[PDB]
Design a protein around this ligand. Structure first.
Ligand SMILES: CCCCCCCCCCCCCCCCCC(=O)OC[C@H](COP(=O)([O-])OCC(O)COP(=O)([O-])OC[C@@H](COC(=O)CCCCCCCCCCCCCCCCC)OC(=O)CCCCCCCCCCCCCCCCC)OC(=O)CCCCCCCCCCCCCCCCC
Ligand SMILES: CCCCCCCCCCCCCCCCCC(=O)OC[C@H](COP(=O)([O-])OCC[N+](C)(C)C)OC(=O)CCCCCCCCCCCCCCCCC
Ligand SMILES: CCCCCCCCCCCCCCCCCC(=O)OC[C@H](COP(=O)([O-])OCC[N+](C)(C)C)OC(=O)CCCCCCCCCCCCCCCCC
Ligand SMILES: CCCCCCCCCCCCCCCCCC(=O)OC[C@H](COP(=O)([O-])OCC[N+](C)(C)C)OC(=O)CCCCCCCCCCCCCCCCC
Ligand SMILES: CCCCCCCCCCCCCCCCCC(=O)OC[C@H](COP(=O)([O-])OCC[N+](C)(C)C)OC(=O)CCCCCCCCCCCCCCCCC
Ligand SMILES: CCCCCCCCCCCCCCCCCC(=O)OC[C@H](COP(=O)([O-])OCC[N+](C)(C)C)OC(=O)CCCCCCCCCCCCCCCCC
Ligand SMILES: CCCCCCCCCCCCCCCCCC(=O)OC[C@H](COP(=O)([O-])OCC[N+](C)(C)C)OC(=O)CCCCCCCCCCCCCCCCC
Lengths: 100, 174, 105, 67, 8, 165, 315, 51, 95
């Protein structure tokens, strides 16, 4: 989060407006980043606290999971276009409707 | 995310006979199911809420499923036609399965249960309060404070402040 | 919502088909110079009005204000009661004081 | 007077202001009645809520009869 | 209904 | 699929919004874009509250000022061209058959709906449009909506001064 | 997902549209008949048997006459107003409280406010495209009164939603199982009648679409099918306001035949105030919509804020 | 009279919520078993596809 | 990648509305209507951002309030030149 220049009474309302702290899949990850930004500050927290930054961005940004999903779907279509996979076995056994 | 390092259970461990009843057969007879099966539901949901692990307390989930199956088999042995009529009136009564649309067959079902098993139906909001149980499973861990030995050190309040050596050390000053 | 799109497109399609068949069923006569003329009573023939524009602006300000009065029916059983009451009483009271002040001035 | 003039010209606004004052009074009455008892600890929780006996929240549960 | 439940 | 249909409709209405010049016709293109934007933001969300809020605020509340100003601005009627209608229909049928020949699972959005969530999620079963709107009326974010109502009153005070009445 | 839900939803919606349209035709018959009986004179008669196929005599005539245009060159903008008007009047009925499920509208009041907020849009394109100063004056006057009581209607229905605790229209049924809301909300009943005769252009709020100060506000150049679609859309709005009065104040009672008897009675009340009251002015209607009804709306909304807080502690 | 009607509606929805809380953990355990099984087949399918 | 497949279209239509905002072939009313077009695209992109988080969608009516006040401000600026510049200032291609 951005460090404001001035710490007046007028940052008290703006500060809580967006935050993963309200119930969320991994706000407990963000807290583990945010307290780290209390420890080293904002600028040393960019270097000394890089492992906890990437987990929160991985969780809520959903980057490598969606990239892995698109790698698994494009490889299946490449195998379909290259003739390795065809017919009724193009798609696997579907999950149950209440599985997830 | 699931890799080869994570230990998922085998499919033979997951091959458990399941409660395959419909919505009307689960909504009807629920108030006698919860009172009879309150020892395993609370422990299984405490396992699900505390650890938040799908692989943990699978034996508790199996115990919940087996207890529900035992209660429905006990209902099937004695009071079958009354429960079938109660579930039928509950499904044909309204869109959502609301208990207030027909109370005529609910009294017959509770009369059958009171005559056979001598069980009392609980109140309307008995199962929506807070449940306090003596769980045998130990709580996992207290949330420990993370240790940062090299933080950003500020000037302490107990640090003495003598006057500065040659003042400001600016051009032509002090 | 996907059924709502289908039924709204069906209502639009049915109304356009009914109007197209009405235009076919309408009696086609010779088109005229005076028949196409805009109607002014009898003999043949407006600037911007600021009062109606500030009426639309007052409607817009009160509409966006109503869009914040809209959520709090749901929140009343899922929030702090003192905070909810303080915000609701303050909200409608400042709205009433502003309405009465704009009435008096 | 002043209230006679407001009751003569604008009686619906006077009646609405009486209703709003009554609503504010019974809103404060409802807030005081909610916070006089343990209104923050509702009797009928949503979801499936369980507490073990070591928790401090398990000692604050309500054992009242259903109304 | 209850007829789905196998005998055990 | 219908998300891709709304993508195609928004693309077609945007390129005809770029093409046309008559101000009430751009206002009509905006009012028919707002419906598709409302539905398409309704596809990502748990419930359709904010689409309704955007609908009342933007279309029925605000754009009627734009429709009134653009109606009194232009004396003349629309010059309807069958070429632009044919080009819009051709690009629309092309983009719908392109969505037919494309896998919809990879093209679907990653944002979860109310039914795309987990079954064991406790918060989804409570009340529709409850936890998302909760922070509007709770400490300490209620000062923003109090400031918003004050901002709307101050906006009306600004507008009365700048139009000079 | 089970396909008979889609099939029965489609069948029920089309049956609703067909029955609403035939009830619009018979509502025009009822209005011409009992509106005559408001005075000494008789209603329609002498066509068919006892005047019953008189709206079909209207429909055969209006679908045969020459579709004239306010200008000869470009008139496609003249077409799009009765299409969208009848589309909104037949589309607003999907938020009717159906106990057998047709559409699970958990936010029905917002849908009603959306369709009412398009009512201004169809009357604005009705006014502008008809190329006449009378048409523009009537369109601006109708847009003025409908956005003036849009804010009031939103606040009144917003006060009503506090009673049932949610936006689901079927929740009006469960809170009316012991008594109707006509007992508790009688000044709200009079205010809601003044609201419902303002969004739909009727005689008490008729400076928009009257035959005295203007010859016709926005139907002045509309004829030969466009006037038929506009007339059917306005009478469907009357039927929707009668139903929405009968759901909120009178008990929803969707299945009982007494609910539809009361719906015909509230349509009779709409035609009863059609023959009685004179027409308001522009200045007096700006006084009514923004001061009296707005002050009553905010005040009695404060009353239900206090009452719903008082019952929340007691329950 | 509205207070009595709201009390009746409140006790009806509390009864429905208590029935939902009874039905819920069996369905949670069934979802748990199907979720673990489907994760196993998804891992096996990803392993055989990406060879 | 993620940007190419997800949320690429609001960027493209935002640049199209920006180019319609600043083109010399349009007029001031077209600038204001294209401005509310990019307001709609900004709402689309902001809602795609805000729905990665679960229960922070309440910010969507804050940006709506500010941008609607911007639009009413721009209309009241533009029609304030009616009594001064005349009714023909809406057809001005340059400022
Ligand atoms: C097998 C192949 C057979 C041959 C196919 C040939 C196709 C190409 C040639 C036809 C063609 O496109 O001509 C272009 C020719 C030129 O049109 P335009 O000048 O580009 O634009 C139309 C005018 O603005 C319209 O100006 P207007 O206001 O005078 O229009 C009158 C209006 C009258 O509209 C109606 O009568 C329709 C009634 C309501 C319908 C429902 C609501 C809409 O007609 C239409 O709207 C036509 C549809 O358009 C037509 O002939 C339109 C019909 C096709
Ligand atoms: C040119 C005009 C601006 C001159 C700015 C500097 C003036 C000298 C100064 O401030 O010295 C500080 C020093 C005082 O500093 P100090 O060395 O006693 O210690 C600094 C201590 N504090 C900062 C707490 C005060 O003054 C002198 O040394 C005496 C200066 C005599 C006057 C010389 C300038 C004449 C006026 C300008 C004529 C043109
Ligand atoms: C032309 C449009 C006329 C005005 C239509 C306003 C509809 C209300 C606005 C809205 O976003 O509604 C959401 C609603 C969805 O409401 P919902 O999501 O609250 O309802 C749940 C859905 N059911 C009832 C099926 C369980 O969507 C629509 O109304 C779709 C409108 C399609 C318009 C097609 C033509 C363009
Ligand atoms: C089955 C029923 C059969 C009979 C009825 C049949 C018809 C159905 C109902 C139709 C109703 C009429 C519809 C059209 C109305 C047209 C007239 C109209 O709009 O008039 C506007 C008029 C205009 O007000 P006005 O009359 O003051 O303004 C005109 C006078 N000048 C301009 C000079 C100021 O009335 C109102 O707006 C009144 C406000 C709303 C109603 C009152 C609510 C007040 C709050 C509740 C009571 C408060 C507590 C009181 C007790 C305690 C006091 C301390
Ligand atoms: C799909 C219908 C598209 C209609 C259309 O774009 O018509 C072109 C006309 C364009 O009007 P115009 O007068 O601005 O035309 C300038 C654009 N050229 C010269 C390229 C055609 O738009 C309309 O008539 C708008 C109708 C309402 C659209 C909603
Ligand atoms: C395809 C449908 C074709 C029939 C449409 C209905 C026509 C009914 C009709 O015109 O009846 C009135 C006309 C007569 O009514 P009329 O309106 O000519 O005269 C009324 C009689 N006076 C004036 C004396 C009071 O009926 C006939 O001419 C014979 C109708 C036979 C049945 C037709 C279907 C009825 C349903
Ligand atoms: C509830 C909604 C109901 C909507 C429909 C209500 C009426 C239905 C029953 C009556 C149908 C009338 C059809 C014809 C209408 C136009 C009459 C006319 O002038 O036709 C002249 C035209 C052309 O005749 P013409 O040669 O005299 O026309 C030249 C142009 N003038 C008039 C200037 C000289 O007739 C036809 O095209 C013949 C049509 C025969 C089929 C009729 C429809 C059958 C199916 C229904």
């Amino acid at each position: 989060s951005l460090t404001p220049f001035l710490r007046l009474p007028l940052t008290d309302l703006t500060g809580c407006l967006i935050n993963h702290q309200t119930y969320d899949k991994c706000g407990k990850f963000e807290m583990k980043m945010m307290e780290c930004f209390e420890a080293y500050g904002l600028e040393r927290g960019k270097r000394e606290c890089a492992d906890l930054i990437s987990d929160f961005q991985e969780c809520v940004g959903m980057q490598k999971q969606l990239m892995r999903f698109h790698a698994m779907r494009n490889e299946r279509y490449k195998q379909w276009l290259k003739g390795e996979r065809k017919g009724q076995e193009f798609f696997a056994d579907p999950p149950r409707v209440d599985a997830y | 995310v699931i890799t080869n390092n994570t230990t998922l259970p085998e499919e033979s461990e997951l091959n458990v006979q399941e409660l395959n009843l419909s919505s009307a057969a689960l909504r009807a007879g629920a108030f006698h199911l919860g009172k009879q099966c309150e020892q395993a539901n609370n422990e299984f949901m405490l396992c699900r809420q505390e650890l938040d692990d799908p692989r943990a307390c699978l034996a508790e989930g199996k115990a919940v499923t087996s207890c529900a199956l035992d209660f429905f088999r006990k209902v099937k042995k004695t009071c079958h036609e009354e429960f079938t009529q109660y579930a039928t009136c509950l499904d044909k009564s309204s869109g959502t399965m609301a208990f207030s649309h027909c109370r005529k067959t609910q009294g017959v079902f509770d009369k059958c249960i009171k005559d056979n098993f001598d069980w009392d139906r609980p109140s309307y909001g008995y199962f929506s309060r807070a449940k306090v149980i003596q769980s045998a499973r130990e709580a996992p861990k207290k949330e420990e404070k993370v240790s940062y030995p090299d933080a950003t050190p500020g000037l302490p309040e107990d640090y003495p402040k003598p006057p500065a050596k040659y003042g400001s050390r600016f051009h032509w000053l002090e | 919502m996907f059924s709502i799109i289908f039924i709204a497109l069906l209502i639009l399609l049915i109304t356009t088909i009914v109007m197209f068949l009405a235009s076919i069923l309408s009696k086609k006569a010779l088109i005229d110079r005076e028949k196409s003329s805009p109607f002014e009573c009898g003999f043949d023939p407006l600037p911007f009005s600021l009062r109606f524009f500030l009426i639309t602006i007052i409607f817009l300000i009160f509409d966006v204000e109503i869009a914040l009065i809209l959520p709090m029916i749901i929140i009343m059983k899922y929030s702090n009661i003192m905070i909810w009451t303080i915000t609701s009483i303050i909200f409608i009271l400042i709205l009433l004081i502003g309405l009465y002040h704009e009435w008096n001035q | 007077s002043l209230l006679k003039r407001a009751w003569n010209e604008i009686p619906d606004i006077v009646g609405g202001s009486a209703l709003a004052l009554a609503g504010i009074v019974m809103a404060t009455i409802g807030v005081a009645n909610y916070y006089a008892k343990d209104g923050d600890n509702r009797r009928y929780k949503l979801g499936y809520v369980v507490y073990r006996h070591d928790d401090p929240r398990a000692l604050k549960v309500r054992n009242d009869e259903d109304d | 209904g209850l007829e789905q439940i196998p005998d055990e | 699929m219908i998300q891709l249909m709304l993508y195609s409709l928004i693309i077609t209405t945007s390129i005809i919004f770029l093409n046309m010049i008559h101000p009430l016709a751009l206002g009509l293109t905006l009012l028919i874009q707002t419906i598709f934007v409302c539905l398409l933001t309704g596809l990502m969300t748990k419930s359709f509250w904010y689409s309704y809020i955007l609908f009342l605020i933007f279309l029925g509340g605000m754009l009627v000022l734009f429709i009134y100003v653009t109606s009194l601005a232009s004396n003349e009627m629309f010059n309807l061209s069958m070429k632009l209608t044919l080009f819009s229909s051709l690009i629309l049928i092309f983009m719908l058959i392109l969505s037919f020949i494309m896998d919809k699972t990879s093209s679907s959005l990653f944002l979860m709906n109310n039914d795309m969530q987990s079954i064991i999620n406790m918060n989804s079963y409570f009340m529709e449009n409850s936890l998302s709107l909760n922070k509007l009326y709770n400490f300490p974010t209620n000062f923003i909506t109090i400031l918003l109502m004050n901002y709307l009153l101050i906006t009306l005070i600004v507008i009365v001064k700048i139009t000079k009445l | 997902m089970f396909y008979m839900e889609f099939i029965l939803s489609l069948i029920g919606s089309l049956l609703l549209i067909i029955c609403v349209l035939v009830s619009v035709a018979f509502l025009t018959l009822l209005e011409r008949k009992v509106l005559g009986y408001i005075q000494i004179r008789k209603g329609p008669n002498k066509v068919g048997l006892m005047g019953i196929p008189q709206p079909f005599c209207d429909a055969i005539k209006l679908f045969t006459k020459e579709q004239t245009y306010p200008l000869l060159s470009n008139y496609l903008s003249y077409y799009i107003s009765p299409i969208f008007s009848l589309f909104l009047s037949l589309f607003v009925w999907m938020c009717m409280p159906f106990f057998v499920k047709l559409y699970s509208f958990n936010l029905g009041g917002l849908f009603f406010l959306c369709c009412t907020s398009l009512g201004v849009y169809t009357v604005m394109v009705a006014g502008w495209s008809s190329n006449s100063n009378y048409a523009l004056l009537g369109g601006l006057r109708a847009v003025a009164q409908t956005i003036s009581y849009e804010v009031s209607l939103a606040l009144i229905l917003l006060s009503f939603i506090f009673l049932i605790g949610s936006y689901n229209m079927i929740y009006f049924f469960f809170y009316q199982v012991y008594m109707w809301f006509l007992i508790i909300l009688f000044p709200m009943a009079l205010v809601w009648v003044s609201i419902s005769l303002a969004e739909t252009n009727r005689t008490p709020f008729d400076f928009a679409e009257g035959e005295s100060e203007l010859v016709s506000g926005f139907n002045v150049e509309y004829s030969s099918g466009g006037f038929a679609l506009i007339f059917m859309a306005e009478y469907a709005s009357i039927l929707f306001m009668s139903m929405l009065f009968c759901v909120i104040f009178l008990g929803c009672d969707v299945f009982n035949l007494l609910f539809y008897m009361k719906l015909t009675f509230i349509s009779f009340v709409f035609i009863w105030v059609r023959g009685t009251l004179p027409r308001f002015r522009y200045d007096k209607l700006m006084y009514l919509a923004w001061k009296c009804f707005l002050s009553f709306s905010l005040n009695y909304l404060l009353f239900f804020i206090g009452f719903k807080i008082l019952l929340f502690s007691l329950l | 009279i509205y207070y009595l009607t709201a009390k009746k509606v409140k006790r009806d929805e509390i009864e429905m919520r208590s029935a939902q809380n009874v039905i819920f953990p069996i369905l949670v355990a069934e979802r748990d078993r199907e979720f673990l099984r489907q994760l196993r087949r998804n891992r096996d399918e990803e392993a055989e596809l990406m060879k | 990648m993620i940007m190419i497949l997800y949320w690429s279209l609001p960027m493209i239509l935002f640049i199209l509305g920006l180019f319609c905002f600043v083109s010399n072939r349009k007029h001031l009313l077209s600038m204001l209507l294209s401005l509310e077009f990019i307001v709609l695209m900004l709402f689309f992109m902001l809602f795609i951002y805000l729905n990665m988080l679960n229960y922070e969608s309440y910010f969507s009516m804050m940006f709506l309030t500010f941008s609607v006040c911007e639009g009413a401000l721009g209309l009241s600026i533009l029609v304030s030149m009616i009594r001064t510049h005349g009714n023909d200032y809406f057809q001005s291609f340059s400022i």
